[PDB]
Paper text:
The Sec translocon provides the lipid bilayer entry for ribosome‐bound nascent chains and thus facilitates membrane protein biogenesis.
Thus, to investigate an early stage of the TMH insertion, we prepared translation‐stalled ribosomes, which exposed the first 48 amino acids of FtsQ, including the TMH within the nascent chain, and incubated those with a 10‐fold excess of SecYEG‐ND to achieve complex formation. However, our structure revealed a very different organization of the complex, as SecE TMHs formed a helical hairpin in close proximity to SecY C‐terminal domain, and the hairpin was tilted within the lipid bilayer by ~30°.
Author numbering:
A (entry chain E): 1 to 18, 21 to 41, 60 to 118
B (entry chain Y): 18 to 37, 43 to 296, 300 to 426
The structure:
Amino acid sequence: XXXXXXXXXXXXXXXXXXXXXXXXXXXXXXXXXXXXXXXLLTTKGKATVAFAREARTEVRKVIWPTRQETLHTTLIVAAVTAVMSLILWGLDGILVRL
Amino acid sequence: ELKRRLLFVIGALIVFRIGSGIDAAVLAKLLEQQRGTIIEMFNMFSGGALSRASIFALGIMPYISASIIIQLLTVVHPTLAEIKKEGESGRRKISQYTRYGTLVLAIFQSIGIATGLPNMPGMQGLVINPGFAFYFTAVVSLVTGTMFLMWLGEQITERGIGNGISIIIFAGIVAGLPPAIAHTIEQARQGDLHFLVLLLVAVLVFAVTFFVVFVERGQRRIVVNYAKRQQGRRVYAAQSTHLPLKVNMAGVIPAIFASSIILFPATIASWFGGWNWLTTISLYLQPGQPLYVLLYASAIIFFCFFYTALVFNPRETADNLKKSGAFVPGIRPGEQTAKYIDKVMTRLTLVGALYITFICLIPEFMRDAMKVPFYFGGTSLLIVVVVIMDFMAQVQTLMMS
């Protein structure tokens, strides 16, 4: 079961189409994906399916919407970005000035 | 003290950001050009080393590029697989051999430039011509600069805090920002930049950061229980304490790694005119194409598995749990608990690096739609938010101590 990656290769070459050599390279790598698919892939499929059950299991640890922790994070990163920018200004204004 | 470690690293990186035969104005003209998106990428990775035309032009990118290489030598060359696993001694000889691969990589990369990039006093300058005295002085100044940065980063990882190099480039791009935003608001009074799209890029930046911090909010805490009565009789409970295991670690390692491995072959390999097929392949190697970012992603996730597997050593953690007196009722201690935490941590962190690659890919489509390049990039937004978050959490964490 390596089929979905090759369908994704078809989709990625179709995205790369719309200027001929790059679309040909995307098609060539899609052909390489099919060559890998010509002959583990079903075990990779079942592994990723297991990983998606694990994903959901780990979704249960994802903290649901909180506007407060959002604003905490928000203001933290806004503050930190302002800090780095003030660092950057204190350095490059007088350094470029000099 | 602890106050002096932070103000020593701060001072070191402040004279780094001041110090960070080629007429540089010509290059400053060349960086206003599309179709080589990777140049702008080199000024992010360089946080502006080739915009400022630094003395160290590509930075610390060779060093990180060796740290992956050796991990291959752990796999291949079992004689090498035995010396990597050989314990304490031998490792500092491997670290000096990583240094010696770096140094021959800086030699090799200077060859790659002065063969590949130049062959014109626009790409070169007036003092440094295609003679081997100019070639040699060029290589000498660029390798001496990268060595200075290598030594300074071997003093800051040890007697200073964390990484540092991340923050070096990071402050290079934040201080590269005000002209770039000056240009955007000059083109905002022009119809080049439309005001709807520019506030759209400001809000997509804000919502991707929100997604980052949402991936950071819920982690996964495993409640383990301790039944403990201290023999002093001041006995209260059987207490269930969660181990709040966290996702992706201390600087997304395959992003920085993958970026060094992206930017090495486009200068050295693809720039050989004299061979022609190799030059054509280098020209194709443009990050306007989905193939490169897919292969980079596959690299990153595999590399992420490896790096994370490096970070934790689950048996020590498990021994600690036996030492600290907590138990998950029903699972055999040791290997089964080991195997358990390992499979689960893999399955989580893999999803983490996946969504990391998802937040990584979209800004590039934003950069195709807007015309953005190595500036607001899908790789660097994430790494800057996580370095700042990490260090301030580690600062509060070590402020309790």
